[PDB]
């Protein structure tokens, strides 16, 4: 079988710059009839995927000339010169001629901006939730850049894995940052068995982790 | 105009079945191969399989993820394409798309049809105030929020002070928890404006006919 590798997962760019996306294969996908069925599609947020380039370098009618596909045998490239707002979304290379027939992992075109540390805020369980027998501790890690971030939960100083659910926002249309929310959900019983609750974040903006905690007492 | 229309989406029962259709018009149906793809909310687009044209005998190919469990078929007299999904799983919750394929590859796609595989029943969410601890250093700005827990189906709407607070707001994508959805939202205001000025999250869950205004009390 042929292995397809689309890179990168994420592609930060500035408006006006060119972007290059890569689709490579573990072996040749040229068909005996001479064609190479390597296609490129764009899927904008909340939209159906749309064709951009077919058979490696054929730009579909209606696609701006800024877009172009190239490549050969095992290595393929989608180039976008002078990137504009309309181009933001997820690009996928695709081939359905060799097993596994498939789309690539996707490349999300995003906007480049200055590094920004997150604003971390932790919140204890409300009396309303407690009365219902549950205890959720919430931590927001807001407006950071770049998107990569790590969060650790600790109860009484020991790391906690069970019961943690996380959510992430799409890049902010206005300030180009990212935000994250993590919630540690415990029973009232377990919550009332411990005192220290910590949400700790590590981001490329600092070697020191951001630590936010609260004590039940 | 070349047209592909998916339909049949809805809530599916785990272990059940569901047949999606893709009605076409505007071109010669039998000349084309047809593809089915799906995109789970918060996940990548995924290829499911295709059915070839008349010249190729309408044979089929499937992804390893669904081979033997989904069936792709086509009614050549009606110009309709089907996706028979058997023994539904939660991983099948996604927006499904059909697309023809030919010399111009997948040049025309349908608008998609959404499927959600769950045994849950409509359930209002519990709305909880998120206020900073008694012991927590002062700041220039203060962040508050609301945890909207355990509802079904999607979605819920969250505003702050009736949309009066729009800037500095982050409503996070919902996640599945205990077979129900949970979401949170954050709002950031200057520290001098609160608690002197009330901050309330207005959460609406139309399916259960609920609207909750939760005030963030210190
Ligand atoms: O038969 C032709 O001349 C066109 C197809 C050329 C080979 N194809 C390439 C091919 C066909 C279908 C797709 N698609 O996504 O639907 C992609 C690539 C494979 P097969 O012979 O049908 O197995």
Report d(CA B116, CA A9) in Å as an integer: 27
Within B2-79, strands assigned E span: 3-7, 10-12, 18-25, 33-39, 46-51, 60-62, 70-75
Residue A86 DSSP SS3? helix
**Closest chain B residue to A136, measured at CA:** B147
* Angstroms from A126 CA to nearest CA on chain B: 6
**DSSP letter (8 states) at residue A190:** H
Report d(CA B60, CA B71) in Å as an integer: 9
Residue with CA at minimum distance from ligand 1 atom 7: A97
Q: What does each C-alpha distance from A54 to A32, A80, B171 come to in angstroms?
A: 17, 15, 38
Check the CA dihedral A184-A187-A188-A189 and report its sign. negative
Q: Do A140 and B147 touch (CB under 8 A)?
A: no
Q: Do A181 and B107 touch (CB under 8 A)?
A: no
In this structure, the strands spanning A107-111 and A10-13 are parallel
Tell me the Cα Rg of chain B.
23
Tokens of B81: 């394409």
Domain A114-216 architecture = Sandwich (2.60)
Judge contact between B19 and B96, C-beta under 8 A. no
CA atoms within 13 A on the CB side of B189: 21
* Angstroms from B29 CA to nearest CA on chain A: 19
Domain covering A1-113, topology: Immunoglobulin-like (2.60.40)
Residue A46 DSSP SS3? coil
Judge contact between A134 and A186, C-beta under 8 A. yes
For chain B, percent helix, then strand, then coil, each to nearest 5? 5, 50, 45
In this structure, the strands spanning A67-72 and A58-59 are unpaired
| Contacts for A32 with CB less than 8 Å, ≥ 6 apart | none
Q: Which atom of ligand 1 is nearest to the CA of B47?
A: 15
* Angstroms from A169 CA to nearest CA on chain B: 6
Which of B49, B184, B194, B213 should one mutate to test binding to chain A, selecting the residue with the greatest count of A CBs within 10 A? B184
CA atoms within 13 A on the CB side of B66: 26
Resolution (A): 1.9
Strand partners, A95: A102
Q: Do A119 and B143 touch (CB under 8 A)?
A: yes
Judge contact between B158 and B186, C-beta under 8 A. no
For chain B, which domains are there?
Answer: 1-119 (2.60.40.10), 120-218 (2.60.40.10)
CA atoms within 13 A on the CB side of B130: 30
Tokens of A139: 């931590």
**DSSP letter (8 states) at residue B123:** B
In this structure, the strands spanning A10-13 and A39-43 are unpaired
- Between the two ends of chain B, the Cα-to-Cα distance in Å is 59
- Name the maximum alpha-carbon separation found in chain A: 74
Instruction: Assess A48–B contact: CB distance below 8 Å, yes or no.
Output: yes
Domain ranges of chain A: 1-113, 114-216
**DSSP letter (8 states) at residue A128:** H
Judge contact between A164 and A180, C-beta under 8 A. no
Q: What does each C-alpha distance from A70 to A22, A24, A53, B22 come to in angstroms?
A: 10, 12, 10, 33
Burial of B26 (0-12, 13-18, 19+ CB in 10 A): exposed
State the method.
X-ray
Report d(CA A152, CA A155) in Å as an integer: 10
Judge contact between A65 and A14, C-beta under 8 A. no
């Amino acid at each position: 079988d042929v292995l397809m590798t689309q890179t990168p997962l994420s592609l930060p760019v500035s408006l006006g710059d060119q972007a290059s996306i890569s689709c490579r294969f573990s072996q040749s996908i040229v068909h005996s009839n001479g064609n190479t069925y390597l296609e490129w599609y764009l899927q904008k947020s909340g939209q159906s995927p749309k064709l951009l380039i077919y058979k490696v370098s054929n730009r579909f009618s209606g696609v701006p000339d800024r877009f172009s596909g190239s490549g050969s045998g095992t290595d393929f490239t989608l180039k976008i010169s002078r990137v504009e707002a309309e181009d933001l979304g997820v690009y996928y290379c695709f081939q359905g001629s060799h097993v596994p027939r498939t789309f690539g992992g996707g490349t999300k075109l995003e906007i480049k901006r200055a590094d920004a540390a997150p604003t971390v805020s932790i919140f204890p369980p409300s009396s309303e939730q407690l009365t219902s027998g549950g205890a959720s501790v919430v931590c927001f890690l807001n407006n950071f850049y770049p998107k990569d971030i790590n969060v650790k939960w600790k109860i009484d100083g020991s790391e906690r894995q069970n019961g943690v659910l996380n959510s992430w926002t799409d890049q902010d249309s206005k300030d180009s940052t990212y935000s994250m929310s993590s919630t540690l959900t415990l029973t009232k019983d377990e919550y009332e068995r411990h005192n220290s609750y910590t949400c700790e974040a590590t981001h490329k903006t600092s070697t020191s982790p951001i630590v936010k905690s609260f004590n039940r007492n | 105009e070349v047209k592909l229309v998916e339909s049949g989406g809805g809530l599916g029962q785990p272990g059940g079945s569901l047949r999606l259709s893709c009605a076409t018009s505007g071109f010669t149906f039998t000349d084309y191969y047809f593809n089915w793809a799906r995109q789970p909310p918060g996940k990548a687009l995924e290829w499911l399989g295709f059915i070839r044209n008349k010249a190729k005998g309408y044979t089929t190919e499937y992804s390893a993820s669904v081979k033997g469990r989904f069936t792709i078929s086509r009614d050549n007299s009606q110009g309709i394409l089907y996706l028979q999904m058997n023994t539904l799983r939660a991983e099948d919750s996604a927006t499904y798309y059909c697309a023809r394929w030919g010399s111009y590859a997948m040049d025309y796609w349908g608008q998609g049809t959404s499927v959600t595989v769950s045994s849950a029943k409509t359930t209002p969410p519990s709305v909880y105030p998120l206020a900073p601890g008694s012991a927590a250093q002062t700041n220039s700005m203060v962040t508050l929020g609301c945890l909207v827990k355990g509802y079904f189906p999607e979605p819920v709407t969250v505003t702050w002070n009736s949309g009066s607070l729009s800037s500095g707001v982050h409503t996070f994508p919902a996640v599945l928890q205990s077979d129900l959805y949970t979401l949170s939202s954050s709002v950031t205001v200057p520290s001098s404006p609160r608690p002197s000025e009330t901050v309330t999250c207005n959460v609406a869950h139309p399916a259960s006919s609920t609207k909750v205004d939760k005030k963030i009390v210190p």
